[PDB]
Every structure is written in structure tokens, then in C-alpha cells.
Design a protein around this nucleic acid. Structure first.
Ligand SMILES: [Mg+2]
Ligand SMILES: [Mg+2]
Ligand SMILES: [Mg+2]
Ligand SMILES: [Mg+2]
Ligand SMILES: [Mg+2]
Ligand SMILES: [Mg+2]
Ligand SMILES: [Mg+2]
Ligand SMILES: [Mg+2]
Ligand SMILES: [Zn+2]
Lengths: 178, 57, 116, 83
RNA sequence: CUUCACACAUGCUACAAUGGCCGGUACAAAGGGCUGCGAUGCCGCGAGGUUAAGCGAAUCCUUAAAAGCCGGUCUCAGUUCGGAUCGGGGUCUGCAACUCGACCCCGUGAAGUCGGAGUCGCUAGUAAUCGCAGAUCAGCAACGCUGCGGUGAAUACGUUCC
């Protein structure tokens, strides 16, 4: 039983009926998935992402990722169709709540010269997306046993209908805004 | 496919230098992830030319 | 061992290893190792977690390091340009600001030879 | 005069052109030849006409140029390029 | 007179381990000084500030010579090599340091890993390296010039060739 999930349905779940006037308890927003991908564009050359971009997201998120292939060829990017260019992991259920705790508690203040996250990064429906620096911040990968550094970007997908309905939800979970 | 391809993800205790500690589930072997900065001992979680001419004179 | 966000290189003496922080050179690293009692001739692999707390707070109360120092250097350059002083016009063109000679030298503010 | 023992340096004929216009609250343009005079926090809002060799360039002290000399804002040399 | 798409010339500092840094400790010569030289004492991390002894000088000040020696550390790295550029804060002289001074402290840490065709000096206290002093001078762009001493080499068969 992860601590962020039980803290959600103890006081976060009740507080959103006061900030927003819902008439039914099924309308209360809830984060449904957290999607993480590297997006390794330097894999159209050198063919080394199995050792470096799969062995680290397995350690960060818990489960092995999916290798994503290119949909169309681009001549300017030195790319084909069906070429491994992206590496995605999807987090559901109870491993989502443990990743959102472990991101906001011990990970996210290890960004070099960290000052916050911006609250204008909503897509219009209530789904936040930020990005990170490198194979730093997460302790589960070590800095000594790795290849070249590479960053990622993290989606957070809610059931909220609008923007600030998802801003009030992630402020309560523990995303630092400004 | 949720069998013997995923890495080891067992329960884990994390301590901090401040004294805050909690228990989650991570991939670190031994359950001994130790941080030096956390969500309570970090800043931002807890907080002209005219004035320099006067300071010279 | 991470100190302020700099990730000190292992097997290096603490007299010199702190100079890899952007903001600390040789004389300021002599007083980090004076107000915290850590001797100069100690390798950084033997750096104790009890020791590393003592010098992650003397710096944040008395020094100015990465991020909020590098944003003071580039902001003082930014002050000179839009007020239109002589050094601000001299920064916009890549020519030396401190009265240097521009006839046969200043190959540092400029690049290598263009050879017209 | 550059040392923190004898204060800043303004030419005395320039002080009695701005002290006689701070009291009666007017912002007339001051024609001057004193490039060497240090800007002080009584020039805020004024303008000047500093001589650079050939003409008088208008310079308007706003707030953020109060430590520099007055002749830094009037370039004495002209260079557009060799080609 | 100090500009700057460039080009040549004379130098200086480097590219390191026959070295860098830190601590200790020996050895000079020739010069300069009343609109001056500032011993000592205190203050300052330092440039220097202040007090003022002595002295027209084989008397007093300049005056700590540096390489060298002894010990410790660094262990071949664009570095504890290199110190360019730039940011901040200062001292001094001078009516005045913006164009356009030198010095100091802190931070910053560029090129450079011994240099193509070609080319330069030197036959002995010489070359190579290390300091110090003078003249002009309020200060100084002094790495220049005129001097001074310390440590101290390698070769010259020979006149075929330039
Ligand atoms: Mg001339
Ligand atoms: Mg050095
Ligand atoms: Mg003293
Ligand atoms: Mg020795
Ligand atoms: Mg290089
Ligand atoms: Mg080398
Ligand atoms: Mg001869
Ligand atoms: Mg002189
Ligand atoms: Zn803590």
C-alpha cells in the first residue's frame, strides 16, 4: 500500500469538492497514467540504445520499456521507417503512485540549480508534461556504470476536464510550481 | 509478459540527512537508498546602482 | 561526491578538488578547509558523509557558486549593453574592453585569422 | 577621484549648473564639455550634451548609469568596417 | 597620435616532472636618494595607510637578491601545466584615470602538447638561464634601452661547399 495513494484518498480527494463544486463523487479528478520516454535521436547512428537507453529506464521506473519505431523516413534527420528512435515506458496502477512519490520526494530536488516547474505546461485538458536533464537525478542508475548522458520527458495524464482543475490536483500531490 | 523479464522491484527504506525517512518500493539492491537532500531539507520547498553609490559614500 | 551540484572527481586532493566548483579557486578553497576543520591533504574518496554536511552549508552562507554566480556574471554584462556605455558597445562587437591594443593582437576576443 | 578617500569627482562648474536646476524643478538640456565628471544621483532625469570631439551627443541618465563617467556615453571614434 | 576584415618585424611568457606549488635556509656586484629615501612601531589577506628614528650619504635608507640547497606533496593530465579574456571590489599618483595609467585581492581559466618552406645568434667567464640597479619620470603601458653580478656548458677534423 503506497503512501501517496492512501494520502490521495484521505484529504486530497475531499479537498477538491470544496475548491470545485462537483455534484457527484465520480467527477473528482484522478491521475491515470504517467508516461516516460527518452526519445533517443542519436540511435539512427551507432545502434547503441539497448545497452544505454533500455538498461536505465528499467532501473528508474521499474518495468522494461518498449522500443518505438519511426513512422516515416526523414532525409534531413538521417532516418528510416521502422528504425528504433524512441524508448517508452508506461506506468499504471500502484507503480504509478510509487513513482510519483519517488519523483517528488527524493528525485526532483536533485536537479542542478533547481528553481521549480512551470504551471503553464498544460495541454488544455489538464495533462502536465515536463522534462529532465540527464541520467543524474534518479539514484537507481549510477553515474559510474553508464554511457553518454541523456534526458527524458514525463507526461502526467489526469481525468480533469480543464487546466486549473489539474493544477489544483498536482499542487496537492507535491509538484513544485511557481 | 509480467514474469522474469522485469528487474527486481522490492520494498525499500530511504533515509535522509535531515532526519526525514519513509518507505517505498524501488529497484535499489538491499533496500538501502540514502539521499543527501529531500523534499523538506531543500530550498524552494521551505524558502541597484544607486544603492551601491551610497554604500561607497 | 556531489557537493553543490558539481560531482567532484574521485582520487583528488581536497585542496584542489574544490576548485572544480565554479566560484571557488585556490585561496577560497583554503578557507573552506579552515572553517570546517578538514585537512588539506585528504583524498576525496575518504570524504565522510558527516564531513560533507559541514561544507555544504559554509558555502551556502558565505560564498557564491554555480547558477546564482553565473547568472550574476552574465547579468553584469547585460547591464552594460542596453545602457549604452563604452564597454557595452565594445561587448557587442567582440573587441577587448579594458583598453587593449587592437592593431596586432586581441586574438582572444576575436577568433583565429580571417586572412583577407 | 577614483579613490574612496576623497569622494567622487564632479567638475565644480557642472554642479552649479544642476544644483541651480534641481531647486526650481526644470529639465533643460545641459551643454557641457566635461567628459570626465562622474555621474551622481542628482543627474537622475536630467539630460546632457557631452562633447566627443566634433559634436554634442545627447545622453539621458535614467537610473542605471549612476556610477559611470559621463563621457562613456559619447564615443569619440567612428568605425563602420573595412569593407 | 592608443582605431582594426588584415600583413610583416623585434621581443616577452608558455606548451611542463632537468617541472609546478607549500614550508625551512645560504651567497652578490654596480647604482640612487631633501618638492626626497621612509628604519622601527601599530593597522590592512594585499597594493599600501599612519607615526617618525637616522641621513646631502664607505655612516642612515634603498636591502628580502633570484636561480641554488634541504624536506613535503602533485604522478603525466589541456593538468595543482599555462595565465589570455571577462565579472565584481580596492589602493596610489595627479586639477582629472571614460576614450587612455600602473599595482593589489577574489572569481573566471582562452590558445598552446616544441612549430611548414625557410631562417638567427654565439668560440669562454662565451652561449644558455637567474635576478638587481640606473637614465627619462607626478605616475606609467619598462617585456625596450644602457649597465651589474650569480650559476655556467658543448664543439672547432678541416677550407670541399654557401
Ligand atoms: Mg606612436
Ligand atoms: Mg600555476
Ligand atoms: Mg601584519
Ligand atoms: Mg627539490
Ligand atoms: Mg586544443
Ligand atoms: Mg604533456
Ligand atoms: Mg671571433
Ligand atoms: Mg619611473
Ligand atoms: Zn532532509
Amino acid at each position: 500500500q503506497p503512501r501517496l495513494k492512501e494520502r490521495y484518498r484521505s484529504e486530497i480527494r475531499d479537498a477538491l469538492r470544496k475548491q470545485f463544486g462537483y455534484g457527484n463523487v465520480m467527477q473528482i479528478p484522478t491521475v491515470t497514467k504517467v508516461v516516460v520516454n527518452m526519445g533517443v535521436g542519436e540511435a539512427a547512428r551507432d545502434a547503441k540504445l539497448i545497452n544505454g537507453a533500455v538498461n536505465d529506464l528499467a532501473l528508474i521506473t521499474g518495468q522494461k520499456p518498449e522500443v518505438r519505431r519511426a513512422r516515416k523516413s526523414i532525409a534531413q534527420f538521417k532516418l528510416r521507417e521502422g528504425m528504433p528512435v524512441g524508448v517508452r515506458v508506461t506506468l499504471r496502477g500502484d507503480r504509478m503512485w510509487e513513482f510519483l512519490d519517488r519523483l517528488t520526494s527524493i528525485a526532483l530536488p536533485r536537479i542542478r540549480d533547481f528553481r521549480g516547474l512551470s504551471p503553464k505546461q498544460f495541454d488544455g485538458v489538464g495533462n502536465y508534461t515536463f522534462g529532465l536533464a540527464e541520467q543524474a537525478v534518479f539514484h537507481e542508475v549510477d553515474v559510474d556504470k553508464i554511457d553518454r548522458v541523456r534526458g527524458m520527458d514525463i507526461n502526467v495524464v489526469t481525468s480533469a476536464a480543464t487546466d486549473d482543475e489539474g493544477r489544483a490536483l498536482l499542487r496537492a500531490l507535491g509538484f513544485p510550481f511557481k | 509478459m509480467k514474469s522474469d523479464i522485469h528487474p527486481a522491484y522490492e520494498e525499500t527504506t530511504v533515509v535522509c540527512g535531515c532526519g526525514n525517512t519513509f518507505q517505498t518500493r524501488s529497484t535499489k539492491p538491499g533496500g538501502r537508498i540514502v539521499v543527501e537532500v529531500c523534499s523538506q531539507c531543500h530550498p524552494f520547498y521551505t524558502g541597484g546602482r544607486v544603492a551601491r553609490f551610497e554604500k561607497r559614500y | 561526491a556531489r557537493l553543490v551540484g558539481v560531482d567532484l572527481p574521485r582520487d583528488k586532493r581536497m585542496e584542489v578538488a574544490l576548485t572544480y566548483i565554479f566560484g571557488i579557486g585556490r585561496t577560497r578553497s583554503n578557507e573552506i578547509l579552515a572553517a570546517t576543520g578538514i585537512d588539506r591533504d585528504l583524498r576525496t574518496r575518504d570524504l565522510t558523509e558527516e564531513q560533507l554536511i559541514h561544507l555544504r552549508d559554509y558555502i551556502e552562507a558565505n560564498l557564491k557558486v554555480e547558477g546564482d554566480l553565473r547568472r550574476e556574471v552574465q547579468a553584469d554584462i547585460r547591464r552594460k549593453i542596453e545602457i549604452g556605455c563604452y564597454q557595452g558597445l565594445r561587448h557587442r562587437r567582440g573587441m577587448p574592453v579594458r583598453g587593449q591594443r587592437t592593431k596586432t593582437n586581441a586574438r582572444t576576443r576575436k577568433g583565429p585569422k580571417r586572412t583577407i | 577621484p577614483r579613490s574612496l578617500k576623497k569622494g567622487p569627482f564632479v567638475d565644480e562648474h557642472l554642479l552649479k549648473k544642476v544644483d541651480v536646476q534641481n531647486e526650481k524643478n526644470t529639465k533643460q538640456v545641459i551643454k557641457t564639455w566635461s567628459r570626465r565628471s562622474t555621474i551622481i544621483p542628482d543627474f537622475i532625469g536630467h539630460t546632457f550634451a557631452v562633447h566627443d570631439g566634433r559634436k554634442h551627443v545627447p545622453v539621458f541618465v535614467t537610473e542605471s548609469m549612476v556610477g559611470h563617467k559621463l563621457g562613456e556615453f559619447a564615443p569619440t571614434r567612428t568605425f563602420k568596417g573595412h569593407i
